Write an enzyme that holds these catalytic residues in place. Structure first.
Site, PDB file in Angstrom:
ATOM      1  N   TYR A   1      -7.848   1.511   6.862  1.00 38.59           N
ATOM      2  CA  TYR A   1      -8.724   1.824   5.705  1.00 38.59           C
ATOM      3  C   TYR A   1     -10.237   1.567   5.797  1.00 38.59           C
ATOM      4  O   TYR A   1     -10.879   0.765   5.255  1.00 38.59           O
ATOM      5  CB  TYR A   1      -8.236   1.415   4.657  1.00 38.59           C
ATOM      6  CG  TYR A   1      -6.964   2.140   3.954  1.00 38.59           C
ATOM      7  CD1 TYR A   1      -7.043   3.195   3.244  1.00 38.59           C
ATOM      8  CD2 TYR A   1      -5.677   1.393   4.287  1.00 38.59           C
ATOM      9  CE1 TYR A   1      -5.894   3.666   2.948  1.00 38.59           C
ATOM     10  CE2 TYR A   1      -4.483   1.945   3.770  1.00 38.59           C
ATOM     11  CZ  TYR A   1      -4.474   3.229   3.183  1.00 38.59           C
ATOM     12  OH  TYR A   1      -3.507   3.625   2.933  1.00 38.59           O
TER      13      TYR A   1
ATOM     14  N   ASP B   1       0.992  -1.147   0.069  1.00 40.05           N
ATOM     15  CA  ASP B   1       0.097   0.023  -0.130  1.00 40.05           C
ATOM     16  C   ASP B   1       0.803   1.296  -0.002  1.00 40.05           C
ATOM     17  O   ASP B   1       0.700   2.153  -0.782  1.00 40.05           O
ATOM     18  CB  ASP B   1      -0.977   0.080   1.091  1.00 40.05           C
ATOM     19  CG  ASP B   1      -1.902   1.146   1.189  1.00 40.05           C
ATOM     20  OD1 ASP B   1      -2.640   1.474   0.403  1.00 40.05           O
ATOM     21  OD2 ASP B   1      -1.625   1.854   2.220  1.00 40.05           O
TER      22      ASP B   1
ATOM     23  N   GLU C   1       4.960   9.983   4.400  1.00 37.46           N
ATOM     24  CA  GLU C   1       4.798   8.718   3.872  1.00 37.46           C
ATOM     25  C   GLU C   1       4.280   8.864   2.211  1.00 37.46           C
ATOM     26  O   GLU C   1       4.326  10.075   1.779  1.00 37.46           O
ATOM     27  CB  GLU C   1       3.819   7.787   4.729  1.00 37.46           C
ATOM     28  CG  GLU C   1       3.767   6.391   4.215  1.00 37.46           C
ATOM     29  CD  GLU C   1       3.166   5.591   5.002  1.00 37.46           C
ATOM     30  OE1 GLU C   1       2.516   5.797   5.970  1.00 37.46           O
ATOM     31  OE2 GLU C   1       3.214   4.261   4.961  1.00 37.46           O
TER      32      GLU C   1
ATOM     33  N   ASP D   1       4.599   0.580   3.895  1.00 32.70           N
ATOM     34  CA  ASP D   1       4.598  -0.624   4.579  1.00 32.70           C
ATOM     35  C   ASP D   1       4.505  -1.983   3.621  1.00 32.70           C
ATOM     36  O   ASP D   1       4.333  -1.570   2.349  1.00 32.70           O
ATOM     37  CB  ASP D   1       3.107  -0.673   5.679  1.00 32.70           C
ATOM     38  CG  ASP D   1       1.969  -0.132   4.834  1.00 32.70           C
ATOM     39  OD1 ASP D   1       2.110   0.160   3.662  1.00 32.70           O
ATOM     40  OD2 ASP D   1       0.779  -0.620   5.430  1.00 32.70           O
TER      41      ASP D   1
HETATM   42  O1  LIG Z   1     -15.669  13.440   7.741  1.00 36.10           O
HETATM   43  C1  LIG Z   1     -14.579  14.215   6.898  1.00 36.10           C
HETATM   44  C2  LIG Z   1     -14.548  13.166   5.331  1.00 36.10           C
HETATM   45  O2  LIG Z   1     -13.883  12.062   6.084  1.00 36.10           O
HETATM   46  C3  LIG Z   1     -13.640  10.919   4.842  1.00 36.10           C
HETATM   47  O3  LIG Z   1     -12.875   9.930   5.430  1.00 36.10           O
HETATM   48  C4  LIG Z   1     -11.535  10.060   5.984  1.00 36.10           C
HETATM   49  C5  LIG Z   1     -11.478   9.857   7.477  1.00 36.10           C
HETATM   50  O4  LIG Z   1     -12.132  10.359   8.086  1.00 36.10           O
HETATM   51  C6  LIG Z   1      -9.941   9.789   7.895  1.00 36.10           C
HETATM   52  O5  LIG Z   1      -9.684   9.368   9.237  1.00 36.10           O
HETATM   53  C7  LIG Z   1      -8.911   9.009   7.110  1.00 36.10           C
HETATM   54  O6  LIG Z   1      -7.442   9.164   7.184  1.00 36.10           O
HETATM   55  C8  LIG Z   1      -6.620   8.316   6.576  1.00 36.10           C
HETATM   56  C9  LIG Z   1      -6.002   8.750   5.368  1.00 36.10           C
HETATM   57  O7  LIG Z   1      -6.934   8.982   4.095  1.00 36.10           O
HETATM   58  C10 LIG Z   1      -4.807   7.961   4.791  1.00 36.10           C
HETATM   59  O8  LIG Z   1      -4.019   8.268   3.687  1.00 36.10           O
HETATM   60  C11 LIG Z   1      -3.745   7.551   5.943  1.00 36.10           C
HETATM   61  O9  LIG Z   1      -2.583   6.510   5.753  1.00 36.10           O
HETATM   62  O10 LIG Z   1      -4.430   7.170   7.119  1.00 36.10           O
HETATM   63  C12 LIG Z   1      -5.330   8.284   7.577  1.00 36.10           C
HETATM   64  C13 LIG Z   1      -5.614   7.899   8.970  1.00 36.10           C
HETATM   65  O11 LIG Z   1      -5.882   6.574   9.210  1.00 36.10           O
HETATM   66  O12 LIG Z   1      -9.266   9.316   5.444  1.00 36.10           O
HETATM   67  C14 LIG Z   1     -10.587   9.277   5.133  1.00 36.10           C
HETATM   68  C15 LIG Z   1     -10.546   9.620   3.700  1.00 36.10           C
HETATM   69  O13 LIG Z   1     -10.393  10.999   3.551  1.00 36.10           O
HETATM   70  C16 LIG Z   1     -15.041  10.675   4.195  1.00 36.10           C
HETATM   71  O14 LIG Z   1     -14.292   9.942   3.238  1.00 36.10           O
HETATM   72  C17 LIG Z   1     -15.662  11.763   3.676  1.00 36.10           C
HETATM   73  O15 LIG Z   1     -16.810  11.289   3.339  1.00 36.10           O
HETATM   74  C18 LIG Z   1     -15.789  12.902   4.799  1.00 36.10           C
HETATM   75  O16 LIG Z   1     -16.585  13.872   4.228  1.00 36.10           O
HETATM   76  O1  LIG Z   2      -0.799   3.515  10.810  1.00 36.32           O
HETATM   77  C1  LIG Z   2      -0.067   5.054  10.632  1.00 36.32           C
HETATM   78  C2  LIG Z   2       1.439   4.334  10.340  1.00 36.32           C
HETATM   79  O2  LIG Z   2       2.091   3.110  10.936  1.00 36.32           O
HETATM   80  C3  LIG Z   2       3.257   3.155  10.686  1.00 36.32           C
HETATM   81  O3  LIG Z   2       3.799   1.850  11.545  1.00 36.32           O
HETATM   82  C4  LIG Z   2       4.236   2.678  12.873  1.00 36.32           C
HETATM   83  C5  LIG Z   2       3.253   1.605  13.957  1.00 36.32           C
HETATM   84  O4  LIG Z   2       2.075   2.457  13.786  1.00 36.32           O
HETATM   85  C6  LIG Z   2       3.840   1.920  15.275  1.00 36.32           C
HETATM   86  O5  LIG Z   2       2.917   0.903  16.355  1.00 36.32           O
HETATM   87  C7  LIG Z   2       5.284   1.471  15.455  1.00 36.32           C
HETATM   88  O6  LIG Z   2       5.390   0.442  15.187  1.00 36.32           O
HETATM   89  O7  LIG Z   2       6.212   2.340  14.488  1.00 36.32           O
HETATM   90  C8  LIG Z   2       5.680   2.095  13.092  1.00 36.32           C
HETATM   91  C9  LIG Z   2       6.699   2.763  12.422  1.00 36.32           C
HETATM   92  O8  LIG Z   2       8.082   2.084  12.404  1.00 36.32           O
HETATM   93  C10 LIG Z   2       3.364   2.336   9.183  1.00 36.32           C
HETATM   94  O9  LIG Z   2       4.567   2.165   8.934  1.00 36.32           O
HETATM   95  C11 LIG Z   2       2.822   3.506   8.292  1.00 36.32           C
HETATM   96  O10 LIG Z   2       2.702   2.362   7.043  1.00 36.32           O
HETATM   97  C12 LIG Z   2       1.361   3.833   8.647  1.00 36.32           C
HETATM   98  O11 LIG Z   2       0.755   4.700   7.879  1.00 36.32           O
END
Ligand SMILES: OC[C@H]1O[C@@H](O[C@H]2[C@H](O)[C@@H](O)[C@H](O[C@H]3[C@H](O)[C@@H](O)[C@H](O)O[C@@H]3CO)O[C@@H]2CO)[C@H](O)[C@@H](O)[C@@H]1O
Ligand SMILES: OC[C@H]1O[C@@H](O[C@H]2[C@H](O)[C@@H](O)[C@@H](O)O[C@@H]2CO)[C@H](O)[C@@H](O)[C@@H]1O
Ligand code: CA
Length: 454
Positions: A206, A56, A422, A59
């Site tokens: 996700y 993805d 990232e 990671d």
């Molecule tokens: O409410 C605001 C909007 O939210 C959207 O979803 C977002 C989540 O709220 C958000 O936590 C998440 O974050 C991800 C990021 O997209 C990702 O790249 C990353 O690696 O980790 C983050 C944290 O876990 O993203 C989503 C999507 O943007 C809704 O999709 C939308 O409808 C709403 O208006």
């Molecule tokens: O999920 C957010 C990011 O996590 C990164 O991994 C971290 C992990 O969450 C921690 O528990 C700790 O182990 O350190 C990691 C970094 O070495 C991950 O690498 C990312 O891909 C994620 O977006």
């Protein structure tokens, strides 16, 4: 070449990024000589070959929701801007990536109502810092079924396959037909279940936040374009009534971005082009207006140096994706004349921001003072399960768009900063499309036959 940056080089590299994300047994078309075979046992805990697809982000989890959204967006890029891909010599490369990922989705669909949506455990994967080829932790595979469903991921995967069936039909008609039949079946699986209750392994990473009605529309649009079966257009249009709303209201939420979770904006744009109906123009224009000149008196935040700034985590992803939508809609004969120029100039500004208009490129291996320490295990290539060893990344992750700056334009370049630094499949997905349009407009020649060889 008539623009501020070499857009063909940027396009060529942004496509090449996906090579570096490849999982499984690498095919002989891969250009680079530094990635090797990895994750070769994927699926064996469930008796299947689930090798392939893309890791993805930085990671080694395979998360099929952003992976399939990526799939769809790369094919949408070809659908809109094929002539740009042909002129830059990049068509073969982006089709290789589209074929790659949709081949893995086919593998993940071993019974009509059985779909594998993940390979890898987030906790186990993230706890170790090293390159893909030497991973030693368990990598379980996870599936949704009729009794334990995942309509969001299944529908998004249907979209990806339907879109691929269009753009890969000339090169590989047999495979395109296979993809279309799997798309139809997956769409039915998502519609019959209308639930994400079994979509659990990606929680914390996700989740389906917005629900699956946006994906039901989006996948039905792609299936309509692939089949010309008007039932799919009826469905696409119908499910609009259940699209994400501004909380507590009946108004479709225009204040976010087209992204891995929420595909209703792109669905609206394509329904506007297909049907011509004001309803859909109203949806997509509210959104694009909010990002540009304003809608009903409110406008997204902008940084001082001109980035349209939605969120601090992957700000460039959201702006560059919105740029691609702005280009596609402004290219449409139905777009209002004046909004044509507003939308196009907005898209140019956001792509130029990514590439370095504020003084610094945010694309690995491209431009001025690009990121050198992206949060990416395999580019770094530690032998010591440590982000600090080596101090410099062993490999250059050409084309990778990083998360992006703060709301004040600032940025650092730290391997440990997974919020701002990232890289990810979904980050590059709309960006590729937007780059094709900028190359179309302004040129800049790719590096002939460039391969990332050490
Ligand atoms: O409410 C605001 C909007 O939210 C959207 O979803 C977002 C989540 O709220 C958000 O936590 C998440 O974050 C991800 C990021 O997209 C990702 O790249 C990353 O690696 O980790 C983050 C944290 O876990 O993203 C989503 C999507 O943007 C809704 O999709 C939308 O409808 C709403 O208006
Ligand atoms: O999920 C957010 C990011 O996590 C990164 O991994 C971290 C992990 O969450 C921690 O528990 C700790 O182990 O350190 C990691 C970094 O070495 C991950 O690498 C990312 O891909 C994620 O977006
Ligand atoms: Ca959704």
């Amino acid at each position: 070449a008539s623009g501020s940056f070499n857009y063909g080089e940027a396009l060529q590299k942004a496509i090449m990024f996906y090579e570096f994300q490849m999982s499984g047994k690498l095919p002989n078309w891969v250009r680079n000589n530094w990635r090797g075979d990895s994750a070769l046992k994927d699926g064996q805990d469930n008796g299947l070959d689930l090798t392939g697809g893309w890791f993805d982000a930085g990671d080694h989890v395979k998360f099929n929701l952003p992976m399939s959204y990526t799939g769809t967006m790369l094919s949408w890029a070809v659908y809109e801007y094929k002539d740009a891909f042909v002129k830059s010599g990049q068509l073969e490369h982006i089709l290789n990536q589209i074929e790659w990922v949709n081949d893995y989705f086919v593998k993940c669909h071993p019974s009509k109502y059985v779909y594998y949506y993940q390979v890898g455990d987030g906790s186990k994967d993230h706890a170790w810092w090293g390159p893909a080829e030497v991973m030693q932790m368990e990598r379980p595979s996870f599936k949704v079924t009729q009794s334990s469903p995942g309509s969001t991921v299944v529908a998004e995967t249907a979209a990806s396959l339907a879109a691929a069936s269009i753009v890969l039909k000339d090169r590989n008609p047999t495979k395109a037909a296979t993809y279309l039949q799997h798309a139809k079946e997956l769409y039915e699986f998502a519609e019959v279940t209308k639930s994400d209750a079994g979509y659990t392994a990606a929680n914390g990473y996700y989740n389906s936040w917005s629900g699956f009605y946006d994906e039901l529309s989006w996948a039905a649009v792609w299936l309509y374009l692939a089949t010309n079966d008007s039932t799919y257009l009826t469905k696409a249009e119908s499910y609009v009534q259940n699209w994400p709303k501004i909380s507590g209201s009946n108004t479709i939420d225009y204040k976010w971005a087209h992204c891995w979770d929420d595909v209703h904006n792109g669905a609206a744009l394509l329904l506007a082009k297909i049907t011509g109906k004001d309803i859909y123009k109203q949806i997509i224009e509210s959104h694009l207006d909010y990002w540009t000149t304003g809608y009903n008196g409110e406008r997204i935040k902008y940084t001082p140096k001109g980035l349209a700034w939605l969120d601090q985590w992957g700000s460039l992803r959201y702006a560059t994706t919105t740029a691609f939508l702005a280009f596609v809609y402004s290219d449409w004969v139905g777009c209002p004349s004046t909004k044509k120029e507003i939308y196009r100039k907005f898209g140019e500004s956001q792509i130029d921001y990514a590439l370095g208009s504020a003084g610094r490129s945010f694309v690995v291996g491209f431009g001025t003072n690009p990121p050198k320490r992206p949060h990416h295990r395999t580019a770094h290539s530690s032998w010591a399960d440590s982000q600090s060893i080596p101090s410099y990344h062993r490999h250059t992750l050409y084309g990778a768009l990083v998360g992006g700056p703060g709301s004040d334009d600032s940025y650092t370049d730290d391997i440990s900063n997974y919020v701002n630094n990232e890289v990810a499949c979904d980050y590059n997905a709309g960006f590729v499309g937007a780059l094709a349009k900028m190359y179309q407009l302004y040129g800049g020649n790719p590096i002939p036959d460039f391969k990332a060889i050490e």
